[PDB]
Symmetry: D2
Subunit: 218 residues, 4 copies
């Protein structure tokens, strides 16, 4: 069964934009994490242990749930134990490195891939993650696209996050992503071939990078 | 887009158990009415015009949304315009007869159908529709399966409504016949499955037409 | 200890304005009903037994809590037993008659009273009670001032309810209350003076009439 | 006039006991901060500019509202602008010092004062402000009395905070357990100390006679 249900995302902030979705977190035991999208809705499924682990580890997403989430119902108090476990870290350089390195892979290999929508979705994930992580290190808790652009005013932050649900395949994405990486003083990881990025993602445990690279194939 | 979102059903009452689903209503403009079931969740999609019509027509489901629904968000105020349009009727005999007639068909043809799940679900619909309507007529707003059996205490109400969540099969026909007796029900003047199709079309029993043709699939 | 808190009124409808208050209902065990107003906040205190009684008696205020109230927290489920006990009556002529009789007393004696604020509050109470009850009798659940004037289109409904928080002493209030009473085919009860209004309110169990009458003095 | 309403405190955590209150925050334009207490309810009134200031200055109480408060309604979106302005400070030693100095004053002079109630309220504030400051510096967000004693397990932490006879023995036992140092101060030198260190709560308490 489903122990608890939380509204998060822009709907929990009372904000909306052109193609906004509705974000719902369903806590149910004995299931591996997954999500289902259905006509502008998004259902995120987590088991209770994974929810508590994200708080103990100080996941940026866990910070969002505790900062802006709204409980719809909670029959087990799992969201209370979730907030009790939350430990906000002082250093998110690991998350910054993941978004940094995947941005370089997408720059080197993603701009002509067939799955344009996945590239755009994950280009935004890179810029979003770096912006969220850098702001938390500075003592701020920011998650909305409009506020990330104002609080982390690097080159093309708004444009690149705006790709999150776009099928835009213009080559101006490559020039803008390169300008953003330059504005944050990014350096490409010591890799070249696609196979080397795979090994580097494994070495640095960049799960989203591995999922993105493999997902672009088919 | 999605203007408003409402939690309804047993979760909105804090009465979810093990077999319970999670009921969510999403108001989206332009979409045709449909539902989607995903891992114990049920998403109901309506356009604003359809939502207001159910209020003006005093639909039993609309009374549930207005009485027990818990608004999660509503950017357009559509739920307020929904409640201002609500007109509870003093007479729900039309809805009562729809469930009464379909109950007779399921008693006469559904007890040995292949799709046992659909028959069990639609048997629960007949009993629940009748219980809800009778209680609204007396001035009560009741929708919990447990409270429907206490406030509408007819024979086997809890057992038959429980058939949606499914059990003592092959005694269902006896329990359904017992319920039809306790409500002083009468079978409509039909005696063929085609005569049931004809009766459902005259009386505009859409749930019956869907049920009958759904058992053939 | 406060076991449950509910938001009601216009804030729960998402349509409060600059002149609105914030309506909060607090349930505390072993306490008699009373109200405390604080910097445009209104705190209503009830015990669980009084709350559930208003549902069983079908109080018009209880209908509002059930169809428009939003729970802030509820550690005892008292709002769940509240809704299970609700019984909407087919007739509210008693509440209508209470509002009519008090309106006539204010018209006959209150238009030059010292406590103008109390008179303006209870004038709005009379018209609101009558409008709410009539709309409930017709199967509708209306409570906001704007919708009451639209759904109960009688003379000066909007103006008279607008006196709720007004210190206006103009005699135009008296002419408007008379025009309203004439539009609902109201008739003054067979009472001569102020003492006969007292004996009438006591005989007819008009608690609000007795409270208002002695409130001016 | 009231544009936003928020529930905070233990009721927002669903952890109210027999002696709890109901904490409500009302944002009202053009008012000075003040609070009304009505039959176990606590209404706190703020203007939007003051609410955003507490976020920009990283007030401990602002962090509580952002991570634990439950919005009842918000007609202006001020709570989102409130959360956008939040800047968690890298250090809260200033707050810890304020609570430490006042505790030493109350230990040296307030254990037999007339207003026994006010002494118990400010003593709890000292221990609570110190505990909450530790929790924020460590990245935690649950400011309940049980969480404070659990995460800050010094002697008699739950006893002192639980003060809303034996009070002196356990207050000194707390200062000893945290290796606290009394500031170099008489009761008149405690005044000159709070004034120099800008301990507002220490000033208003001593004159008692978020
Ligand atoms: N821990 C998280 N971190 C970052 N954001 C998260 C997290 N949880 C939920 N969200 C939000 C919700 C919001 O809606 C946004 C959509 O944007 P996103 O680009 O999908 O971001 C990601 C989404 C999921 C993952 C986890 C997993 N991938 C997947 O399960 C599927 C498989 C194909 C498509 N993804 C993985 O690789 O480990 C990683 C990134 O994601
Ligand atoms: N008008 C409503 N009456 C009762 N319930 C409704 C209604 N609308 C939505 N619901 C949800 C809430 C609950 O979950 C209930 C259980 O479903 P039921 O199957 O028992 O009852 C139905 C069977 C058929 C239909 C027709 C629909 N076009 C379809 O093709 O299905 C509709 C309902 O359905
Ligand atoms: N890369 C990331 N790292 C950590 N947390 C992240 C994240 N991306 C999103 N989040 C968090 C915050 C979102 O508000 C929230 C929903 O993520 P989302 O993809 O739905 C974007 P949202 O803020 O809802 O605006 P909208 O376009 O849908 O209207 O999940
Ligand atoms: N035949 C009918 N006529 C009018 N309204 C009806 C209805 N059947 C259900 N409803 C209303 C009320 C349900 O609570 C609500 C959800 O319908 P549901 O099928 O999910 C049964 P529920 O009350 O949620 O308990 P559970 O077994 O899921 O835990 O939809
Ligand atoms: N005479 C009556 N009979 C039955 N119920 C009555 C009632 N008067 C008020 N109510 C119910 C409904 C109000 O919305 C609700 C709050 O009553 P209220 O006096 O605060 C008027 P409200 O609807 O909130 O608009 P606003 O002027 O404050 O912006 O209490
Ligand atoms: N000295 C301080 N510095 C910063 N923040 C402080 C604070 N004292 C209290 N807070 C925050 C957190 C409380 O939950 C809340 C105070 O509310 P409260 O003083 O009523 C204690 P509470 O946590 O609600 O439990 P209970 O005893 O009422 O049941 O506001
Ligand atoms: N029984 C009842 N009737 C109407 N309003 C009620 C009642 N009980 C509480 N209230 C609340 C609702 C109003 O906002 C307010 C004005 O009541 P008023 O009596 O108009 O001064 O007091
Ligand atoms: Mn979203
Ligand atoms: Mn999303
Ligand atoms: Mn359900
Ligand atoms: Mn359902
Ligand atoms: Mn009001
Ligand atoms: Mn009021
Ligand atoms: Mn409190
Ligand atoms: Mn308090």
């Amino acid at each position: 069964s489903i122990e608890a249900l939380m509204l998060f995302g822009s709907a929990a902030r009372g904000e909306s934009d052109k193609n906004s979705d509705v974000d719902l977190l369903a806590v149910t035991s004995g299931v591996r994490p997954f999500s289902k999208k259905t006509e502008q809705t998004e259902l995120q499924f987590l088991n209770p242990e994974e929810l508590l682990r994200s708080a103990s580890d100080g996941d940026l997403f866990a910070i969002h749930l505790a900062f802006e989430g709204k409980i719809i119902f909670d029959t087990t108090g799992v969201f209370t134990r979730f907030k009790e476990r939350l430990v906000i870290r002082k250093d998110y350089g690991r998350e910054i490195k993941w978004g940094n390195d995947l941005a370089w892979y997408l720059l080197d290999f993603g701009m002509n891939a067939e799955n344009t929508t996945l590239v755009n979705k994950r280009i935004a994930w890179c810029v979003r993650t770096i912006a969220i992580a850098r702001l938390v290190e500075s003592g701020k808790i920011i998650f909305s696209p409009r506020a990330l652009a104002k609080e982390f005013p690097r080159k093309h932050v708004s444009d690149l996050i705006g790709l999150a649900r776009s099928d835009e395949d213009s080559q101006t994405r490559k020039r803008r992503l390169a300008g953003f990486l330059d504005s944050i003083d990014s350096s490409r990881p010591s890799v070249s071939s696609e196979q080397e990025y795979v090994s580097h993602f494994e070495r640095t445990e960049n799960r989203v990078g591995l999922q993105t690279l493999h997902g672009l194939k088919k």
